[PDB]
Amino acid sequence: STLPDLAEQFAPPDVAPPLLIKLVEAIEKKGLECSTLYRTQSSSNPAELRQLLDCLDLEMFDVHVLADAFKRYLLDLPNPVIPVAVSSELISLAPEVQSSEEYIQLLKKLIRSPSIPHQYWLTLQYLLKHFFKLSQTSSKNLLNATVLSELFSPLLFRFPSENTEHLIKIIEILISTE
Amino acid sequence: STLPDLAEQFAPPDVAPPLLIKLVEAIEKKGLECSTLYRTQSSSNPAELRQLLDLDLEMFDVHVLADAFKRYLLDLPNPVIPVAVSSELISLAPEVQSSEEYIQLLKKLIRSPSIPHQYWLTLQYLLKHFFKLSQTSSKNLLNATVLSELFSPLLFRFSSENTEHLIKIIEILISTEW
């Protein structure tokens, strides 16, 4: 796992990591209407998927392999798209706060902290934008904000324990409200 | 006070913040042989110097560029050498009072995945600058030890045989650049 930190992969005025842009754009061109996108086990194994990530046009690859590399990317980031500091604070407020808008208000506040490079919030915005376009063809790919939230929240937050359904819900809402 | 974090000012494959490159290159073109470079204060005040940090910097008085260079290091939200690293080096004991070991630890901590690569990259660029200045010591009177004593309080932003060791390793890292 040699994948660099989100903050090391790009900086403003760029809006997202160049490699993540290549994946998203390729995946959207080839799999926007695929009813199994992101819900399959492809043939490749982590070492193979890392080869694709560590070293020419992604449109040449099987869409299900790109989808696995997309997941591999999020798993291999040294720190998750949503830092653990943020996840830890949102998780510990769970019994107290039962307001989705406030959780959303707070997630944005914490991830915009000066102690966290802007690249993380920028990356999350790019990912949410991608998840939203997938949901605009949910009739065909079956990916709605809730299903997209259930697939990718454990990758964005990097959590495997049951005081967590609130985190999944904010991602759902953050996808639907773009 | 509005200066962005080093990790937000650039990313690999760039080697240093673009503004810092403009300062260093301008200062080296106009003041490489100046006998009082970095050891006198110019007329401008912090507010004026900050205006400059937002044209071609070769137009400015060299002593203003030198003060803006210092202003830059002071205004970074986190210093070139993060406090995480400084705190560990300061905590070292009389036993491990080996310069080679202090340097070994600085490299280990500042290359940590929890600290963006931009910080170590920035320090390397500065060391390359300090070394080039010390190669003209016959004319500008700047040796590695004085450069370390002048700039260490700006790099670390933090007095005993521990702080004497931090200044000493910077000295060594300047002289041992090539």
Author numbering:
A (entry chain B): 113 to 167, 172 to 276, 280 to 297
B (entry chain A): 113 to 166, 172 to 275, 279 to 298
Publication text:
The N-terminal domains of p85α include an SH3 domain, capable of binding to proline-rich sequences, and a BH (breakpoint cluster region homology) domain. The BH domain can bind to and regulate several GTPases including Rab5, Rac1 and Cdc42. In addition, the p85α BH domain, either alone or together with the SH3 domain, can bind to and positively regulate PTEN activity. The p85α BH domain also exhibits Rab5 GAP activity to stimulate Rab5-mediated GTP hydrolysis required to inactivate Rab5-mediated protein trafficking functions.
